[PDB]
Amino acid sequence: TLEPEGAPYWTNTEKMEKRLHAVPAANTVKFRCPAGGNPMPTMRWLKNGKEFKQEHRIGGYKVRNQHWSLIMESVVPSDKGNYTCVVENEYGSINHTYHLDVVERSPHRPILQAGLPANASTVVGGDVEFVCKVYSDAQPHIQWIKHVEKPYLKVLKAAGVNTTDKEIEVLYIRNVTFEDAGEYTCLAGNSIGISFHSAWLTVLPA
Amino acid sequence: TLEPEGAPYWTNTEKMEKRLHAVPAANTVKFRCPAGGNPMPTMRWLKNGKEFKQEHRIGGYKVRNQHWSLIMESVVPSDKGNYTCVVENEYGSINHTYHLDVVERSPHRPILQAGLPANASTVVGGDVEFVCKVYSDAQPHIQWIKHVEKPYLKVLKAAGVNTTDKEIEVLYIRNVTFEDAGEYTCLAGNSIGISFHSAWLTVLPA
Amino acid sequence: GNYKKPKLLYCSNGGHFLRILPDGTVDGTRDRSDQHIQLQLSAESVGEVYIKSTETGQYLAMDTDGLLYGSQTPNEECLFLERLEENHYNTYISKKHAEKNWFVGLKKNGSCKRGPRTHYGQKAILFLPLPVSSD
Amino acid sequence: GNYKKPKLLYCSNGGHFLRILPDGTVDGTRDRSDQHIQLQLSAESVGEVYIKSTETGQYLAMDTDGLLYGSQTPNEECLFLERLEENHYNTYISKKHAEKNWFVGLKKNGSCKRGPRTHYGQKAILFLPLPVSSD
Known about the structure:
The complex is a heterotetramer, with 2 copies of chain A and 2 copies of chain C.
Chain A: E1 6-10, E2 20-24, E3 29-32, E4 35-38, E5 42-47, E6 50-51, E7 62-64, E8 69-72, E9 81-89, E10 92-103, E11 111-112, E12 120-123, E13 128-131, E14 134-135, E15 141-147, E16 153-158, H1 165-169, E17 170-173, E18 182-189, E19 194-204
Chain C: E1 8-11, E2 16-20, E3 26-29, E4 39-45, E5 48-53, E6 59-62, E7 68-71, E8 79-85, E9 89-94, E10 127-130
Antiparallel strand pairs in C: 1-2, 1-10, 2-3, 4-5, 5-8, 6-7, 8-9
Family (chains A, B): Belongs to the protein kinase superfamily. Tyr protein kinase family. Fibroblast growth factor receptor subfamily.
Subcellular location (chains A, B): Cell membrane; Golgi apparatus; Cytoplasmic vesicle
Organism (chains A, B): Homo sapiens
């Protein structure tokens, strides 16, 4: 039966320990602050410490101060931030803050930086370099190949379990020979697809 | 106080008249079938008339037979279909079916069909045609232009309030003259951007 | 849904299709077989569309009090700014009263929203283009 | 989040970061400042990754009973099939036991899920790559 008057309190802490809410864009998000107290506590939401009105985002949001929750659907990058529930009655005010992280994913084949690797020229005996810079969400597997002996391709360098970023990014060719002239390619593959960029090595005499 | 035994019934019909749920992909969906009855009715969900298990979709789903609802987050095309809630106790079984429509949107500039318009050749005095086929989510504005008098562009035909698809899709040039030789372009713009494809008209003598 | 064919405008709010009735009034229905919900959109310029009912030839329009009506001719009150929010819903803002943000909107009851009473924080202004049938 | 830098693996289930503790056990923590949650992924071939802890050099591995442990060397039990579901979450399937669908998973309590007890219909197997800090 009826229980005594007092400042508000959390009735369910188990649906509230998940402080960081990280979801992909367009997903719905629900923050809970299940409260108790008598008189019946009032609930209020702040977005990055400020009054959070309905018109502050497109589509608004649904507040169920029956469920002590805030629901925002179709989450987008402009919603990222801290959400604070301020719950109070005449004897006190408690509160909690969630962190909303909206992630944007790019399910694509690896994107090689425009123009790399670049063609190179050298006198026989000189040194050259080839650079490859890759952008990828899925973990990519990168390697350097040579279109040769004319059967096709020769693997010059490849990424493995513990090879550094620095190592595979630059392909060094020391003491260039005429045999070293030809096409160099940076090959990058992920679970979505493969991309490659070629560079020609011009070897000159002198 | 306590009320009598009987077959189940809907306690709230207002949160259930929305039969068609059409949402973009990745949004969460919640279907309600708020029931009443005594004994406490049991609730069950079918997907396109079949038993709907948790492993039937990635991420599963949350059933709250406290709320008499089914919640599926991150909706994808494989979820499209009819969802039926079968609610029952010993004296009866009621039911409702929602329709889930998952929409995929393409916020892009207009995509012109590959190779159209196509170049054309004709003897002076003959007739030619130029075709343009457009793909666009946002409503596009399409028009046919000519790169001329060398100031640049001349509008040959343009879409308006009530012009048919047929009309703007094909540009007819009758009685070709040498002046008519030159570059023809189909221009399409939407609120995301503009795209264009060109065709050259070769006019010959005879 | 390519732009070409006639389409349905499904309001997120109550799940209603935008309807232009034979007597010129605008509302929303859940009935997908209703013949007054098939709309052909067209454009004179980038991002601005006319929304016309294939059944009765009337265009959607918004009067100076923010009231939606079906018009017999495409006038300045028939021009809506079409925005695609990546949120993947479309919004239609009266071009005549764009300064005041008057949105095409449908309440949960299927009755029209008036310009003045709409704003960005509502589900009433969120529409989703749907094909006439099966999808 | 480009692949290069070390990252956090955030489980959808309880909001925990995948953690490889110094004694070789695997669990999940909500503490973002914990030094055992920074993971460097690498690959020997398309779609198959090694997941290594920068703090203690151990690799994630799954034993024949579907148990997650931190291994000191990258062996066949350290190879996970990385799938990106357009649903925009990643899943990691043991390559050794791919036939049986054994997923890397974290329960709502932050303790590891065992291969056998996982399946596609769970939030426990859904991970989201997050940067070490601010995002």
